[PDB]
Amino acid sequence: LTGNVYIDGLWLPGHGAPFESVQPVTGETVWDGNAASLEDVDAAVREARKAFLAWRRKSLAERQAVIEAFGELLEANKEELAHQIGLETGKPLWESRTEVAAMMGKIPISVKAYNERTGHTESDVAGGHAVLRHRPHGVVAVFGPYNFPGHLPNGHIVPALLAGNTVVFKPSELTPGVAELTVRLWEKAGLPDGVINLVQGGSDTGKCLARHSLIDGLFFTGSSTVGHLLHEQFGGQPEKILALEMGGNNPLIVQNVSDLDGAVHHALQSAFLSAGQRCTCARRLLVPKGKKGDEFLARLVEVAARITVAEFDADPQPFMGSVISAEAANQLLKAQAAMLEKGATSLLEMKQLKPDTGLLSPGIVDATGIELEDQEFFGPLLTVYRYKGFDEALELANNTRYGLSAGILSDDRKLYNRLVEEVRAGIVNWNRPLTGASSAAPFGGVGASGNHRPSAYYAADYCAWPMASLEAGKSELPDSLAPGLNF
Amino acid sequence: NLTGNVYIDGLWLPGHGAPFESVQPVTGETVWDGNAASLEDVDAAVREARKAFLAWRRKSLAERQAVIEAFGELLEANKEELAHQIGLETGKPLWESRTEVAAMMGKIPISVKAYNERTGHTESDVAGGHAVLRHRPHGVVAVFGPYNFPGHLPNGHIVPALLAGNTVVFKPSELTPGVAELTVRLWEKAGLPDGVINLVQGGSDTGKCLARHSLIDGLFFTGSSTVGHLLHEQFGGQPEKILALEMGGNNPLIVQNVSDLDGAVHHALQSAFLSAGQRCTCARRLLVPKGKKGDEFLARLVEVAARITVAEFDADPQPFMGSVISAEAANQLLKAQAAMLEKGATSLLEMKQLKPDTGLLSPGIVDATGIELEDQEFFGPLLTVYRYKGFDEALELANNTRYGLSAGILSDDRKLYNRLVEEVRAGIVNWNRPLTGASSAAPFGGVGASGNHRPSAYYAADYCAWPMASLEAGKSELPDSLAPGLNF
Numbered sequence: 001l002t003g004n005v006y007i008d009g010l011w012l013p014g015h016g017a018p019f020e021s022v023q024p025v026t027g028e029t030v031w032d033g034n035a036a037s038l039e040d041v042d043a044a045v046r047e048a049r050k051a052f053l054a055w056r057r058k059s060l061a062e063r064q065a066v067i068e069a070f071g072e073l074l075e076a077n078k079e080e081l082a083h084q085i086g087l088e089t090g091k092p093l094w095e096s097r098t099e100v101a102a103m104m105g106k107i108p109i110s111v112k113a114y115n116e117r118t119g120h121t122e123s124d125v126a127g128g129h130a131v132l133r134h135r136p137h138g139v140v141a142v143f144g145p146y147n148f149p150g151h152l153p154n155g156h157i158v159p160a161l162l163a164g165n166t167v168v169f170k171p172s173e174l175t176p177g178v179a180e181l182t183v184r185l186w187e188k189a190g191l192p193d194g195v196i197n198l199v200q201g202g203s204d205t206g207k208c209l210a211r212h213s214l215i216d217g218l219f220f221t222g223s224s225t226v227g228h229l230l231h232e233q234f235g236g237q238p239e240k241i242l243a244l245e246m247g248g249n250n251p252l253i254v255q256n257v258s259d260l261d262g263a264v265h266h267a268l269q270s271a272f273l274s275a276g277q278r279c280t281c282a283r284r285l286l287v288p289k290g291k292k293g294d295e296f297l298a299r300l301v302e303v304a305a306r307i308t309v310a311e312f313d314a315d316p317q318p319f320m321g322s323v324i325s326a327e328a329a330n331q332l333l334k335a336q337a338a339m340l341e342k343g344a345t346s347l348l349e350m351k352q353l354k355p356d357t358g359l360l361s362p363g364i365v366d367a368t369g370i371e372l373e374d375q376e377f378f379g380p381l382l383t384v385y386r387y388k389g390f391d392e393a394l395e396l397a398n399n400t401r402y403g404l405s406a407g408i409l410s411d412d413r414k415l416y417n418r419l420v421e422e423v424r425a426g427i428v429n430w431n432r433p434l435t436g437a438s439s440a441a442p443f444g445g446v447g448a449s450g451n452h453r454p455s456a457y458y459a460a461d462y463c464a465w466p467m468a469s470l471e472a473g474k475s476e477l478p479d480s481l482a483p484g485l486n487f
Numbered sequence: 488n489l490t491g492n493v494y495i496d497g498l499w500l501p502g503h504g505a506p507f508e509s510v511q512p513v514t515g516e517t518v519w520d521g522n523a524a525s526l527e528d529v530d531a532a533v534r535e536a537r538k539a540f541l542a543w544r545r546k547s548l549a550e551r552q553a554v555i556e557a558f559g560e561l562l563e564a565n566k567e568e569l570a571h572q573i574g575l576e577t578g579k580p581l582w583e584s585r586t587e588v589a590a591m592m593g594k595i596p597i598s599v600k601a602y603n604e605r606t607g608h609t610e611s612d613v614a615g616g617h618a619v620l621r622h623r624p625h626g627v628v629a630v631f632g633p634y635n636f637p638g639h640l641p642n643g644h645i646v647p648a649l650l651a652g653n654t655v656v657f658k659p660s661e662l663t664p665g666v667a668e669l670t671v672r673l674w675e676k677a678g679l680p681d682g683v684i685n686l687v688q689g690g691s692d693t694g695k696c697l698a699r700h701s702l703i704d705g706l707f708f709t710g711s712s713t714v715g716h717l718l719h720e721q722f723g724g725q726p727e728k729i730l731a732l733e734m735g736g737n738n739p740l741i742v743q744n745v746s747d748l749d750g751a752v753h754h755a756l757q758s759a760f761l762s763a764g765q766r767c768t769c770a771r772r773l774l775v776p777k778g779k780k781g782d783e784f785l786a787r788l789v790e791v792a793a794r795i796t797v798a799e800f801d802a803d804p805q806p807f808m809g810s811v812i813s814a815e816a817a818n819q820l821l822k823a824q825a826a827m828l829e830k831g832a833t834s835l836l837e838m839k840q841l842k843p844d845t846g847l848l849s850p851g852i853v854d855a856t857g858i859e860l861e862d863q864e865f866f867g868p869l870l871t872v873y874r875y876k877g878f879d880e881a882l883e884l885a886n887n888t889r890y891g892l893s894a895g896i897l898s899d900d901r902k903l904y905n906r907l908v909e910e911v912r913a914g915i916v917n918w919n920r921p922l923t924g925a926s927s928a929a930p931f932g933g934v935g936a937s938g939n940h941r942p943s944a945y946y947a948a949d950y951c952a953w954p955m956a957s958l959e960a961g962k963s964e965l966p967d968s969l970a971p972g973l974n975f
């Protein structure tokens with residue numbers, strides 16, 4: 001807890017302009033530090049490149065041993081890291097600890113994924129004795145969001161390091177402290193010098209890193225906007241492997257449910273967990289028009305009003321905490337303000353709970369006939385649309401260029417079956433909230449939610465490239481020569 | 488038996504573009520005549536492939552597999568006729584064109600196993616419920632085909648794509664349109680629904696109209712790192728369209744400490760001169776240890792290399808290699824080794840034009856040990872040799888290229904190979920076997936300027952299907968322990 005930078009195993013103040021991380025509700029300063037400058041970034045990259053040569057040579061077993069030690073250190077400091085996350089983001093403790101346990105779980109699963117997606121295989125084939133092994137890329141710049149400053153960046157870092165990569169981690173300028181803590185835990189775990197390198201900063205720092213001509217890969221978790229910016233930047237440079245993980249305008253369907261409070265439960269999970277700040281949250285809820293939906297939305301609004309929202313560490317733990325900043329909340333309020341005047345009516349008003357904080361109350365808005373923008377956004381603002389035929393519901397679900405998550409809450413399996421059949425989305429759930437993905441299976445958005453480099457399990461796919469060999473043992477003539485060959 | 492028509496939505500139709508023709512590389516006579524697809528022709532192909540996708544993606548995996556297997560039946564059934572088309576239109580000798588066909592046939596079952604492993608259907612019980620994983624096709628994929636293997640490579644994209652439920656708008660090389668039309672007719676006679684594959688002949692203009700078309704959902708490419716980079720630059724900012732690039736390489740072959748001379752000379756000639764050196768995995772640069780051993784080796788290598796025959800694809804006794812794709816290309820190769828010799832290099836074996844205005848080139852070997860030539864890819868039987876001192880200097884040379892397709896070593900000492908694998912950055916790396924003759928059973932993806940990390944061959948299945956993972960439950964109902972702040 002110092003505010004430094006980290007390069008080649010050494011902690012050093014940044015040469016860039018200082019910035020600070022403020023707590024979303026208290027407003028006081030939680031972090032102070034210097035942002036990485038241009039030459040600072042050149043240093044991080046040069047030293048990760050240097051460390052690569054020695055790190056790529058470590059066996060898979062050794063790299064796994066260091067990473068696992070990192071996991072043991074995660075368990076040992078679970079509460080302190082949880083408290084750091086919740087403190088700096090506004091997420092409640094009970095949820096931050098969830099993010100930590102997720103970081104821990106990302107390890108063994110990343111191991112199995114490495115061994116299946118990019119393992120070592122040996123076989124006898126027609127052209128001789130074929131063998132297949134997987135090689136790391138080199139220096140991968142990892143960008144971290146602010147909603148999960150521990151789970152997601154980790155989900156890039158573990159698979160990459162394990163496979164022999166070296167990392168230049170640039171966290172969000174809204175969650176630098178959690179980043180510094182995680183880096184210290186990699187140090188205290190015995191990670192060779194320069195194998196991971198921390199570069200704090202904001203937009204300028206990320207600019208200097210992304211354009212840097214010596215990175216060998218870039219792994220991104222963040223807004224579809226900046227993700228597309230990066231993808232355009234690398235236009236014409238296929239040599240640098242890019243992984244883009246972006247948002248979505250995720251739809252949730254709830255039709256013909258026999259357990260009301262159950263569907264209200266899973267719905268509230270999907271739309272409001274993490275203050276609606278989980279990238280897999282449902283931003284659009286679809287309910288069959290008429291009487292049945294009226295009953296459902298009645299109960300859903302009833303229970304949603306009952307949700308508590310307070311500081312990350314309130315004596316009785318609330319359901320959700322603050323939004324990252326008071327400004328973000330301001331833009332959300334202006335957002336639903338633009339929705340209402342567009343023609344929508346408020347089923348449940350999104351309210352600012354304390355004077356100049358990011359504490360927002362749940363918000364539900366009906367714009368069934370209205371046409372708002374296809375735009376992603378974090379916050380507890382849920383747009384609801386009422387539909388006639390189910391074949392119309394499927395039309396609505398796909399009514400977005402994003403393609404991350406989508407699912408249906410229903411007792412009828414065939415609604416799910418036809419959903420899976422028709423929907424164009426990354427993860428599509430039935431009777432479980434859109435949130436809470438499984439790291440044991442891929443996690444890759446389609447459309448504007450990724451560039452077809454799915455992470456989580458298939459993370460192992462974009463951390464290592466394949467080397468295939470036809471081994472012989474002795475260069476010697478075939479039984480029957482080809483035409484035109486005389487000896 | 489051929490026509491020269493385009494093929495869209497199951498219908499054969501003359502193209503609306505300007506006419507062109509496919510010439511035999513040595514005979515000079517016309518082998519194909521047809522109209523290239525125009526802008527609206529391509530818009531039609533794409534629109535109709537998109538329409539057909541909706542119906543094709545819903546077929547089960549088994550049914551699509553059955554149609555493709557029927558395609559295999561037809562490949563075996565017409566093996567010799569398709570071989571003759573390939574050899575005729577490219578100049579490749581018959582005996583190896585027959586190989587290209589057998590490779591097309593083999594690309595099927597392996598594409599199946601690949602689909603079931605890399606993008607299958609799996610189910611497991613996990614913490615968040617009963618999780619399931621299935622793999623979906625992208626949609627309309629534009630497939631561009633080379634000219635060295637107008638059958639094997641395009642197929643290596645098409646089978647994996649069709650099988651996974653994609654539809655294809657195939658644009659073949661304007662140097663091998665006939666092979667394309669014939670192959671398409673073979674897909675027709677195989678029962679492929681209308682619009683699931685759509686042939687769009689043409690040259691640069693046609694391919695541009697296809698790549699720029701705002702309705703493709705993927706682009707699969709095999710061709711020069713030059714045009715490949717052009718395409719990649721084009722899609723800059725469009726991650727929604729999945730792109731796979733398969734590009735060339737400045738492939739190095741090292742031969743040090745071989746106790747069987749004629750064997751290593753064999754594998755060398757295979758790697759550098761097979762198919763007139765027009766296989767993308769050919770060794771463009773041979774590395775031989777400085778001094779006596781390399782002197783003897785290269786001596787033998789030139790002796791035997793001179794003994795190579797080169798003639799028409801249908802020579803009475805089949806030669807080792809045929810003509811290069813065109814006489815003009817050959818012209819640029821001659822200009823190439825001329826620029827190397829005047830650059831400071833010495834000619835170990837002169838590349839000569841065997842007939843006046845043809846693509847018949849004789850093997851060419853050039854020593855440029857001290858000279859610095861361009862890091863550039865090129866097809867042709869022109870082999871540059873580099874002599875090295877320490878083995879770590881040989882490794883220094885191998886990576887002396889921005890391309891990263893193939894590389895291998897001819898040696899009796901396994902540890903030289905081990906140090907190669909450890910250090911070399913290339914897609915496929917062979918030991919004591921020719922650089923040519925890859926294995927469709929294992930991935931095939933070049934690094935650096937040889938691809939964008941969407942390797943084909945076995946891993947083709949990865950860029951033909953995207954993953955959908957689901958947490959199924961059965962009934963939306965409250966958990967045992969609620970979250971804090973939820974009242975009912």
Ligand SMILES: NC(=O)c1ccc[n+]([C@@H]2O[C@H](COP(=O)([O-])OP(=O)(O)OC[C@H]3O[C@@H](n4cnc5c(N)ncnc54)[C@H](O)[C@@H]3O)[C@@H](O)[C@H]2O)c1
Nearest residue numbers: 144145146171172173206207222223245246247279376378
């Ligand atoms: N796909 C996912 O799993 C996932 C996860 C989290 C968030 N999201 C999406 O992201 C939205 C919020 O954005 P966010 O804050 O998480 O990510 P972001 O846009 O802030 O990007 C992460 C970091 O990259 C750096 N950066 C900013 N500008 C840059 C630039 N121009 N060039 C290089 N680096 C730059 C900053 O550190 C920035 O905070 C969410 O509401 C949701 O839409 C998606």
Ligand SMILES: NC(=O)c1ccc[n+]([C@@H]2O[C@H](COP(=O)([O-])OP(=O)(O)OC[C@H]3O[C@@H](n4cnc5c(N)ncnc54)[C@H](O)[C@@H]3O)[C@@H](O)[C@H]2O)c1
Nearest residue numbers: 633634659660661691694695710711714733734735767864
């Ligand atoms: N990666 C591999 O496996 C592989 C395979 C074969 C050849 N190669 C290499 O590629 C080169 C030979 O390939 P080639 O000359 O057939 O490639 P190419 O550039 O001719 O590409 C094939 C076809 O694409 C079309 N085309 C041309 N310009 C286009 C454009 N601007 N936009 C869209 N389409 C366009 C034309 O039909 C062209 O002939 C050599 O470097 C060779 O070694 C690599």
